[PDB]
Amino acid sequence: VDLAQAAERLIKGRRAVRAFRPDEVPEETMRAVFELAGHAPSNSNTQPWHVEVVSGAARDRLAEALVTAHAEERVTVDFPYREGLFQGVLQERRADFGSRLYAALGIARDQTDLLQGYNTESLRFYGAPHVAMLFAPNNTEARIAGDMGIYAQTLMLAMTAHGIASCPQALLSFYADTVRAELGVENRKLLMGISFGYADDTAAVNGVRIPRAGLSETTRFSR
Amino acid sequence: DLAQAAERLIKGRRAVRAFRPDEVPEETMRAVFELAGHAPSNSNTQPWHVEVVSGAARDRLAEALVTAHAEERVTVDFPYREGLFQGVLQERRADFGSRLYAALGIARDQTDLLQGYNTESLRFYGAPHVAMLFAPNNTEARIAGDMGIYAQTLMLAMTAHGIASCPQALLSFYADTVRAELGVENRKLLMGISFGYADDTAAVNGVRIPRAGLSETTRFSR
Numbered sequence: 001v002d003l004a005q006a007a008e009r010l011i012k013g014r015r016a017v018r019a020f021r022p023d024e025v026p027e028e029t030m031r032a033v034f035e036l037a038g039h040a041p042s043n044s045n046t047q048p049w050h051v052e053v054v055s056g057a058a059r060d061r062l063a064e065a066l067v068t069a070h071a072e073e074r075v076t077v078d079f080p081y082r083e084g085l086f087q088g089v090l091q092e093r094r095a096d097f098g099s100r101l102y103a104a105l106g107i108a109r110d111q112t113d114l115l116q117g118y119n120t121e122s123l124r125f126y127g128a129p130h131v132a133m134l135f136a137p138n139n140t141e142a143r144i145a146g147d148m149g150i151y152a153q154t155l156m157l158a159m160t161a162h163g164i165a166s167c168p169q170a171l172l173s174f175y176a177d178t179v180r181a182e183l184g185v186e187n188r189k190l191l192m193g194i195s196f197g198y199a200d201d202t203a204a205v206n207g208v209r210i211p212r213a214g215l216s217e218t219t220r221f222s223r
Numbered sequence: 224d225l226a227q228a229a230e231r232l233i234k235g236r237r238a239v240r241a242f243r244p245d246e247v248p249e250e251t252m253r254a255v256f257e258l259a260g261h262a263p264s265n266s267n268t269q270p271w272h273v274e275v276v277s278g279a280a281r282d283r284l285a286e287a288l289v290t291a292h293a294e295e296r297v298t299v300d301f302p303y304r305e306g307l308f309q310g311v312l313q314e315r316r317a318d319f320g321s322r323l324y325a326a327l328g329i330a331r332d333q334t335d336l337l338q339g340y341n342t343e344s345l346r347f348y349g350a351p352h353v354a355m356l357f358a359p360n361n362t363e364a365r366i367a368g369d370m371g372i373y374a375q376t377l378m379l380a381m382t383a384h385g386i387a388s389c390p391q392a393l394l395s396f397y398a399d400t401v402r403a404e405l406g407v408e409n410r411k412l413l414m415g416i417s418f419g420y421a422d423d424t425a426a427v428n429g430v431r432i433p434r435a436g437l438s439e440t441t442r443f444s445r
């Protein structure tokens with residue numbers, strides 16, 4: 001395996017997977033993956049990430065607690081929304097993603113109950129046997145959050161290298177107090193959760209193909 | 224196999240602080256930046272705007288940064304206040320600094336040497352190219368997280384083609400200077416990434432920065 005070919009395979013191969021088989025990732029493989037992810041760089045080598053990996057009965061209790069919190073409207077998000085977050089082309093991209101996702105699920109925007117069933121399953125980690133909750137310092141701002149993203153991508157690519165599918169989910173961070181209470185975590189903010197395991201390649205949702213903007217839209221070269 | 228190749232990329236990438244003058248071939252640069260675009264993001268928003276600078280334009284930019292620093296014209300879009308890092312995070316920062324400054328041969332009391340080192344850092348460590356990572360005006364934690372996803376995708380794509388890199392928060396302390404030299408408006412500068420081919424004869428490139436143990440950053444429960 002040539003390095004240039006390997007990076008293309010990992011980077012393009014990793015996709016947000018929304019339906020998993022129940023089979024667990026072997027403990028030795030999970031150890032190798034999370035050890036490798038720790039090699040992510042960060043400002044001054046601060047490594048601000050605190051990662052809680054949940055499996056088995058603890059993962060089942062956590063899924064049920066999230067479903068209950070969602071039903072009781074107990075939203076406890078650590079990161080507030082900022083006005084005008086997605087305007088212009090950012091809004092166009094979100095709308096296009098939403099349309100492709102709902103078309104792959106076979107759901108129309110007006111089918112409120114079907115959107116509910118789908119979102120209940122999202123809180124059950126899309127059936128994934130494992131979830132990694134990415135906690136960050138209480139004073140996390142843009143620079144620290146950037147490092148949390150560097151880590152998240154290092155982890156997802158290390159998972160892809162071992163045939164482990166993943167879904168990064170901001171949704172899980174909307175019930176941060178529930179995650180903290182279940183896991184006994186104190187004085188840390190929850191940025192996202194990453195559901196992981198082995199993809200169910202028969203699920204239509206895993207056939208969704210999300211495009212990218214391309215060089216003309218993202219990059220400029222000057223000399 | 225793929226598992227070994229991922230280990231080689233993730234562990235092989237290091238912050239390189241001395242470069243050869245040789246340029247990255249244009250076709251390789253286009254392939255690397257197109258591959259980096261495959262980074263995921265919230266709702267596929269892809270909030271990144273990247274300015275890649277080379278040749279005479281890179282020289283003019285480096286000299287403008289050197290001048291801004293010498294004149295104390297610091298302009299920051301994202302604050303970096305002292306005390307941002309506490310407890311173990313502060314000790315990891317101090318431990319890194321002790322390792323870096325020992326490799327550079329610069330003591331804590333050497334103001335003239337620290338100034339000379341910072342001048343070279345604003346000259347992108349002699350790298351033939353620099354990528355300036357611009358983010359939306361209203362960037363907060365979630366959007367910044369996506370910028371980080373992109374930055375790591377880009378650095379690993381570079382490593383795969385034997386391209387060395389150094390992410391630099393330092394360059395974001397002269398945001399108005401970078402904006403003016405590049406004709407950029409209404410975007411915030413998060414960081415710069417200097418890149419090219421490592422000068423393997425430089426002592427600074429021999430530094431190996433460790434990581435906290437898996438037991439220190441990760442907790443498994445069932």
Ligand SMILES: NC(=O)C1=CN([C@@H]2O[C@H](COP(=O)(O)OP(=O)(O)OC[C@H]3O[C@@H](n4cnc5c(N)ncnc54)[C@H](OP(=O)(O)O)[C@@H]3O)[C@@H](O)[C@H]2O)C=CC1
Nearest residue numbers: 043044297303316317319320321324329330331392393396
């Ligand atoms: N307002 C501004 O202009 C700011 C600029 N920056 C820049 O952004 C980058 C990031 O800064 P930072 O993350 O602090 O990294 P720095 O390299 O500045 O400092 C990293 C660590 O090394 C220590 N250190 C500094 N000099 C020595 C030495 N000779 N021997 C041993 N240890 C040493 C620092 O202590 P100490 O606490 O004494 O610095 C700190 O613990 C740098 O280029 C910095 O100059 C960062 C923040 C604010």
Ligand SMILES: Cc1cc2nc3c(=O)[nH]c(=O)nc-3n(C[C@H](O)[C@H](O)[C@H](O)COP(=O)(O)O)c2cc1C
Nearest residue numbers: 015016097168169170171192210263264265266267
């Ligand atoms: C930080 C972050 C948070 C995300 N949050 C969610 C989420 O809550 N639910 C979800 O279904 N997908 C979520 N996504 C996944 C995407 O929507 C996806 O990465 C994007 O559409 C690009 O598609 P791809 O990853 O399949 O290439 C998130 C992605 C990231 C990077």
Ligand SMILES: Cc1cc2nc3c(=O)[nH]c(=O)nc-3n(C[C@H](O)[C@H](O)[C@H](O)COP(=O)(O)O)c2cc1C
Nearest residue numbers: 041042043044045237238319390391392393414432
């Ligand atoms: C977002 C970010 C900003 C950084 N800023 C600087 C910088 O301004 N100057 C510098 O010499 N190194 C900078 N670093 C590089 C590191 O300090 C380095 O990644 C860390 O010490 C781990 O070492 P390694 O990348 O060689 O494995 C930065 C790293 C990141 C991820």
